[PDB]
Design a protein around this ligand. Sequence first.
Ligand code: GSH
Ligand code: GSH
Lengths: 241, 241
Amino acid sequence: TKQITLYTATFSPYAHRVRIALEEAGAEYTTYDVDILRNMPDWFPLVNPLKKIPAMTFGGPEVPPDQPSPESAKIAESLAMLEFIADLFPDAKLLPTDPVLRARARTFMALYENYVNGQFRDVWFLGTPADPLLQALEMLQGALPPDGGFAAGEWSIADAAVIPFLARMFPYLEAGLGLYSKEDGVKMRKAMASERFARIRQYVRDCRARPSFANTWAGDAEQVEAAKTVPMLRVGEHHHH
Amino acid sequence: TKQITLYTATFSPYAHRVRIALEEAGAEYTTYDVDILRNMPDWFPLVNPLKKIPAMTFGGPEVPPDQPSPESAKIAESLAMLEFIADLFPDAKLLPTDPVLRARARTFMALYENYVNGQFRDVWFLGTPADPLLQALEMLQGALPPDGGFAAGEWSIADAAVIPFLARMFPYLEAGLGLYSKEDGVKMRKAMASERFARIRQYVRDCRARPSFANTWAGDAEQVEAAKTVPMLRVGEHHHH
Ligand SMILES: N[C@@H](CCC(=O)N[C@@H](CS)C(=O)NCC(=O)O)C(=O)O
Ligand SMILES: N[C@@H](CCC(=O)N[C@@H](CS)C(=O)NCC(=O)O)C(=O)O
């Protein structure tokens, strides 16, 4: 019954994670866009002192999102939000009930956060080499159940954590967004279309087919355009090794 | 009833996290040391193909830890193990039951993983300037309840996640172990003793005072000696400016 407000930005895969979980939960919630990278509102540190999106408020009196209440609980960090939503909506079964299957979900989130996410960041924003990213994606792909299904079998918050990044990769590569070289762009497009990565392509299709994805995605072209607003995705700059 | 085996190493704060949680759970478990950085056994990739410590097996038939069974569940990534132990031992209350307090625990773990750990790595392994690490520690300190307590109030897995790293800082600094210069060592020791960091000193004392720490710590001197076996700590080496 307590209000949920999610401070969002279309380009932000971290915020996307939390929109997906809130859709899967059947939650009632409000979103409020924040131009966090170009023009942060002066009140935004009241909802997240770290000055990052996503930010969440929970409970407190019903107020406009640009007039946040000191009485709402302020929740930071997208993965903590995913676990919070699973805790708030247990009947939505956003995690398995079996401990080992739950661990598969947590391990998958950690594999992504610790070994893949930084490689996406460094390849796209710094133009570091693509091979370590592809190796990390092959590792992540190896953690999926072979025959189909999601990270822990049934869909869970682990798939909300990972699909925003994987789903952006394909249209961003096709639009040439990112500071990596032409050569590495070709390499990544060929690899991600190759048999080596058939399983993760299935995984991406499977997650994208769910309403929680459709209802939280602007469309491939619209997401590309939002991404071009990110300052670190400087058009015309590339790094080479 | 299902067996737990933790593959560990004394120097490793990641493994330490899981020992602390297992002690707090009152779990029955085996530990088995692995010389992962200098002489990894040929069988170790059977328990963790990532070739990292900690690794955990769960269930399967009882076998010697150097003859792991293909039948046990293989669990990777320390924070996934912490959540697993909390799931296995619900009566030990290793997380709060209140969703907002649980989220404080998850957020604190994410703050550490995302903003603090990499600064510890930069300073200790590369000898980069200490100010960004002290800034990150002040941020992490800021997330604690100011008047006392653990990260989420009552002790939780969040404090298992963080104390191994903070507890190593003071004795490693006293030994001058790490790639930072004497000048930055002095600066860090002074800062960590100053009133700026009184709250995190209280937190370290409060965590260290629990049996789960005492029973999983070799002693400061002994831990320093184990850390000197770590190749990336480059005992006797320091970078300057
Ligand atoms: N670890 C954070 C990362 C969030 C993050 O980095 N958000 C970006 C937008 S995609 C941001 O707000 N950056 C602003 C800044 O770092 O100052 C999470 O998981 O929520
Ligand atoms: N993300 C891992 C980090 C584990 C880790 O880095 N362990 C170190 C020892 S402190 C290791 O085994 N390193 C060997 C390697 O990276 O190849 C976790 O949370 O468990």
